[PDB]
Design an enzyme around this catalytic site. Structure first.
Site, short mmCIF file in Angstrom:
data_model
loop_
_atom_site.label_atom_id
_atom_site.label_comp_id
_atom_site.label_asym_id
_atom_site.label_seq_id
_atom_site.Cartn_x
_atom_site.Cartn_y
_atom_site.Cartn_z
N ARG B 70 0.80 -1.23 0.00
CA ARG B 70 0.00 0.00 0.00
C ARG B 70 0.84 1.29 0.00
NH1 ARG B 70 -2.58 -4.07 2.77
NH2 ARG B 70 -4.68 -4.34 1.93
N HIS B 95 -0.67 -2.87 -4.42
CA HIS B 95 -0.03 -3.77 -5.35
C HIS B 95 0.00 -3.27 -6.77
CE1 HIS B 95 0.54 -6.26 -2.10
NE2 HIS B 95 -0.64 -6.93 -2.09
N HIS B 169 3.97 -13.34 -4.28
CA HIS B 169 2.86 -13.49 -3.38
C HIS B 169 2.40 -14.93 -3.09
CE1 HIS B 169 -0.65 -12.25 -1.24
NE2 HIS B 169 -0.37 -10.95 -1.42
N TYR B 171 1.50 -18.29 -1.08
CA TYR B 171 0.96 -18.57 0.22
C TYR B 171 1.31 -19.99 0.55
CZ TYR B 171 -2.68 -14.80 0.28
OH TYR B 171 -3.36 -13.62 0.29
N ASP B 242 -0.36 -9.11 9.27
CA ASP B 242 -0.42 -8.48 7.97
C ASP B 242 0.56 -7.31 8.03
OD1 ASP B 242 -1.09 -7.81 5.43
OD2 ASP B 242 -3.16 -7.19 5.90
N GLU B 303 6.38 -12.14 1.80
CA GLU B 303 6.65 -11.24 0.72
C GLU B 303 7.89 -10.45 1.01
OE1 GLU B 303 2.53 -9.29 -0.03
OE2 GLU B 303 2.05 -10.79 1.49
#
Ligand SMILES: O[C@@H]1[C@@H](O)[C@@H](O)OC[C@@H]1O
Ligand SMILES: O[C@@H]1[C@@H](O)[C@@H](O)OC[C@@H]1O
Ligand code: NA
Lengths: 339, 346
Positions: B70, B95, B169, B171, B242, B303
């Protein structure tokens, strides 16, 4: 039948064969036509792999845009505001700017309707891309049917007022060989006027000229050699043809042009007002097509769109696209064989 | 072995198998990792076709950029100049903006080096795309070798001074099932500090906080449940993790993070200064992965990038990229078996 195969660099080649045994093929690299053949002969110019297009010439058969043609100084006025687009030919913006939509891999979906098969390519041009306001969601549907008709249908929607006037850049060569001039083809074209070029930069001159009864009047079928051997300064300027012709009658039902060679003929239909014709005036360039060295005049386009130069000659039209409006365009290349 | 097939919408799936039998697969849609399996078990989250990514969630496994994270109000300063970028998350640019690079078909070429196979994806971000000055010629090479290392190498060159700070990205979910929470995984992370977020908008608060000895301290391996169960303001704000963690010691040679479940471990190496960790705090959204409904905390990302918020916290770094200057970044995820003893129960 439909056949899909790797075309290189991650691109695909989608080949359609209709009931008649005619084969047309496309690639998602630039939503483009790669080949079109009958009884083993190519009717258009094309390469054998994605790499070739990128290395040799990225324009042949491609969907070009967002704006096709040359925009003087890369300048467009949008809602009273000046916008400068990517300049890739001197100060001109040609065919949408550098690394445009013809060099991107579009996503696609195939729809088999039996008599007809459609291939829908989609791409999103982000807001600001090459200076163009957006985002523009674009789709180009290439379809081929049992009647030998090759149809191109464009659609677009933008998030912001912008400009939009794409075209299909296929080059025809009924000789089926690039080393052979199209001067032997006969051409008929339903246009009484054209747009002259200023000079070698190929920006428009400023006026609209009546061509009736000149080397460029094709209202009545004529052989290309004529135009080619003309002394008209406009012919002499580019060494062939590289101009926007204004169609006399608008509408999709009218055969606007026809390219003929012997038994074989290509008819053009469009809902666009103009057809830009370029006769591959590359001189000695000698680009290799299927191992064959291209000759000056070894190809011809029928770029249907709103004539370039409307920035200076508003009578030509207006390529603006307002936010939320849906843009639609249709162009058809129909193939015939005399019995 | 290298295999290739259509993956949907014109994208391709490139599947590699190393001499050890481990398989990994990528797609040109977003230069992204699709799957990574050991003994038939998924080590990461992914879908079975291109369309799923486009319809469900386009970020998993993707290359995201040009700037990851962001950017408050979409505002960046480039060579004394203010530029506003596409704002796709409220006034934020998340992003790289809407319809960014993770949504495009990149071209690619495969290089077989025997013990290593490389897949180099390429794409050009045109000047002005989503407000970014360019053009930017980008490339991401994903490689897999016989030593079970999956490496990501980024390269970029711009025609104009711009900003660049992409990331991968993926996971992870060593349970091999999205419906299973990663609270049972063990995590070790070489970071003493973190970057708190201002609020629900998730922009950076403005300060850097020391996390030693709190529930976010993973210097010494601990179960993820310790974090998830925490009532620390920051955890509660996002309902899990996060955040960007600032690495204590930089360099590609050092094991920065290690995620373990039973006999399997994933080690993380990188040349970047921080790791943004997001634990799939999706609540009950329940995105389907292989017909399994994903659970809250059903995944974790690593990330690696320059931390988001450098706009406000200059100390974090500088993501500017000068015209003509070559950008390079390298991140590695290595798979190991029986690296340690991890026998727990949840
Ligand atoms: O000059 C021509 C242009 O008018 C068009 O036909 O595309 C190819 C060439 O650049
Ligand atoms: O909030 C997270 C963000 O921080 C990143 O990790 O990507 C996924 C979500 O958008
Ligand atoms: Na393919």
């Amino acid at each position: 039948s439909i056949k899909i195969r790797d075309f290189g660099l991650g691109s695909d080649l989608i080949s359609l064969t209709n009931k008649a045994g005619v084969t047309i093929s496309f690639t998602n690299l630039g939503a483009r036509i790669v080949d079109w053949q009958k009884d083993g002969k190519h009717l258009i110019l094309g390469f054998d792999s994605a790499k070739e297009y990128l290395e040799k010439d990225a324009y042949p058969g491609a969907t070009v845009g967002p704006t096709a043609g040359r925009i003087k100084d890369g300048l467009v006025k949008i809602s009273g505001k000046d916008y400068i687009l990517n300049q890739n030919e001197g100060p001109q913006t040609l065919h949408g700017g550098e690394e445009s939509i013809h060099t991107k891999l579009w996503t696609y979906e195939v729809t088999d309707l039996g008599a007809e098969v459609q291939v829908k390519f989609s791409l999103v041009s982000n807001d600001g891309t090459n200076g163009y306001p957006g985002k523009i969601e674009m789709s180009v549907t290439h379809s081929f049917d049992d009647d030998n008709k090759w149809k191109i249908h464009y659609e677009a929607i933008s998030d912001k007022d912008t400009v939009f006037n794409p075209t299909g850049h296929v080059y025809f060569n009924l000789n089926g060989d690039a080393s052979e001039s199209v001067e032997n083809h006969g051409l008929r074209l339903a246009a009484s006027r054209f747009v002259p070029l200023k000079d070698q930069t190929e920006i428009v001159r400023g006026d609209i000229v009546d061509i009736k009864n000149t080397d460029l009047d094709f209202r009545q079928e004529k052989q290309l050699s004529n135009a080619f051997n003309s002394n008209m300064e406009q012919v002499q300027l580019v060494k062939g043809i590289d101009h926007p012709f204004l169609l006399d009658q608008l509408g999709l039902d009218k055969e606007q042009a026809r390219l003929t060679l012997d038994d074989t003929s290509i008819s053009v239909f469009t809902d666009q007002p103009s057809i830009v014709i370029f006769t591959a005036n590359f001189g000695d360039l000698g680009t290799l097509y299927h191992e064959k060295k291209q000759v000056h005049h070894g190809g011809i386009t029928f770029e249907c769109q709103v004539s370039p130069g409307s920035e200076q000659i508003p009578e030509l039209g207006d390529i603006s696209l307002k936010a939320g409006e849906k843009y639609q365009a249709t162009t058809i290349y129909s193939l015939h064989t005399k019995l």
